[PDB]
Design goal:
Chain A: This is Oxidase. Chain A: GO terms for molecular function: nucleotide binding; oxidoreductase activity. Chain A: FMN binds at residues 7, 9, 11, 35, 63, 130, 169. Chain A: Keywords: Flavoprotein, FMN, NADP, Nucleotide-binding, Oxidoreductase. Two copies of one chain form a homodimer. With 246 residues, chain A is α+β, with helices and mostly antiparallel strands. Helices cover 46% and strands 13% of the residues of chain A. The termini of chain A are far apart. At the A-B interface, α1, α2, β1, α5 and α6 of A face α1, α2, β1, α5 and α6 of B. β5 of chain A pairs parallel with β1 of chain B, so a sheet runs across the interface. The structure holds flavin mononucleotide (2 copies). One flavin mononucleotide sits between chains A (8-9, 11, 63, 127-131, 153, 167) and B (36-40, 108-109, 112).
Chain lengths: 246, 248
């Protein structure tokens, strides 16, 4: 609770390695997270080797965390293992479909976040890389992920070599809805985002992108319609490649 | 303490007749919202259901699993790009988030919160249970909670003070989940070795017997999560994502 209240994403890491015992203890416990049908529809590829990080780094747009973190974890949706189990038990699996993908993805994210929460409680810094679903084929290729296996997210982990100011969050009245969804009026939006907009960090972000409003940075530079649409089609292509759709 | 709590965690489906105060629920949620979020955008909303008739309305969506009516609190974690797009519309920005990629990005944001919450809730002495039925009946949840365009229900968690002390369920040996550097594909020997313990457990033998099957996976493939249902649901998902504007 104190750890979560005070958490922040860490992108700069010490030279200190994460012992296999610590890492496996964290992972093993993270595997205690809820799982559809007790099935554990995930795999975690652990990348420690410098040469291997070198190869994954372009998949993640060369974010320095990949090469600088002692450990890089690729959390993967995985129905392959369960299907192999089915195949060894005279069972016909029907999990090469989007619903199963989503099911496995949820299982995977639950594990990833439990890991992150436990890693942080242990004094480690973590960073999710969203680039995982931008370049899934590069990750599939790098990590030799076979059919019914799909990388969902990637976390970089190490002992913190920075202590950044915590980023803002919206007032909870903007996120929580009592009994039904209460749509946002312009007045709601202006109230909810007033504080975010007052922060020098966000004002700089607007100015250094030559925008007038904070949302324009997100729409025009960070997460554009063009890219989102390209990535949506790519996602379908890579989902089909991995057997999660026809 | 969170690690020992997680090590010993188990899903709780029976709850004490004891309410979760707003102070506690809101504190847990506010803290859960500190979970990592793409671009710091917070692409989720949480519908909090406490009313009895609201629970009765949600119940069928969740196949009338008892926890919906029995828990003092039912939380529907929703992927939400709507709030951000409304913000865009008020700041002269043209959003392009009515697509699958953006839906998946919001979903992830949402699942991170949900699980941060569940972990915090369990640390606070509560018991939780996820309902997987959320993605079987998203339209019904959409209608029930009045989730508009760019809002999609991802998962639902029933929360309460525990009124059961169930045996912990098993997990696979970690060597069956963790792969060093690259994915190490499973041989029949690997499979047999990994699942041996699971298959030896009386619950699982009972699960097979009471389902008229010969092996554990058959219960899953033939009864619980069937090919036919999975395909139907896959199609249903595309339909509902379309209806909610996360694809054309
Ligand atoms: C995506 C997801 C969906 C779930 N759906 C249900 C469900 O609808 N009904 C239920 O009783 N439990 C559900 N659960 C709980 C699991 O059955 C449970 O996590 C699994 O049996 C392992 O049990 P444990 O959490 O006690 O270790 C779900 C869990 C996940 C992550
Ligand atoms: C799934 C998702 C994808 C993310 N992708 C990246 C990314 O690739 N690069 C990065 O530096 N941070 C990434 N993050 C971290 C967020 O940018 C970060 O959580 C946000 O700035 C809020 O900061 P905080 O975690 O310190 O509160 C991602 C977070 C989420 C959950």
């Amino acid at each position: 609770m104190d750890t979560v209240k005070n958490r922040r994403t860490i992108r700069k890491y010490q030279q200190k390695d994460i012992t296999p015992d610590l890492l496996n203890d964290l992972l093993e416990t993270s595997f205690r997270a809820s799982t559809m049908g007790g099935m554990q529809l995930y795999s975690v590829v652990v990348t420690r080797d410098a040469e291997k990080k070198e190869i994954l780094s372009p998949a993640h747009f060369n974010q320095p965390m990949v090469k600088e973190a002692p450990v890089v974890l690729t959390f993967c949706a995985d129905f392959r293992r369960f299907c192999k189990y089915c195949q060894e038990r005279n069972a016909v699996p029907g999990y090469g479909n989007l619903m199963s993908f989503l099911n496995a993805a949820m299982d995977t994210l639950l594990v990833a976040q439990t890991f992150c929460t436990l890693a942080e409680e242990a004094g480690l810094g973590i960073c999710y890389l969203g680039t995982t679903t931008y370049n899934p084929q590069m990750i599939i290729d790098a990590l030799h992920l076979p059919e019914l296996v799909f990388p969902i997210t990637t976390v970089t982990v190490g002992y913190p070599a920075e202590s950044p100011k915590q980023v803002d969050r919206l007032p909870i009245e903007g996120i929580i809805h009592e009994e039904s969804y209460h749509d946002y009026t312009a007045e709601d939006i202006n109230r909810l985002y007033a504080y975010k907009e007052s922060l020098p960090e966000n004002k700089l972000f607007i100015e250094e992108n030559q925008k007038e409003t904070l949302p324009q940075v997100f729409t025009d530079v960070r997460y554009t319609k063009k890219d989102n649409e390209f990535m949506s089609e790519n996602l379908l292509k890579v989902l089909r490649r991995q057997g999660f759709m026809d």
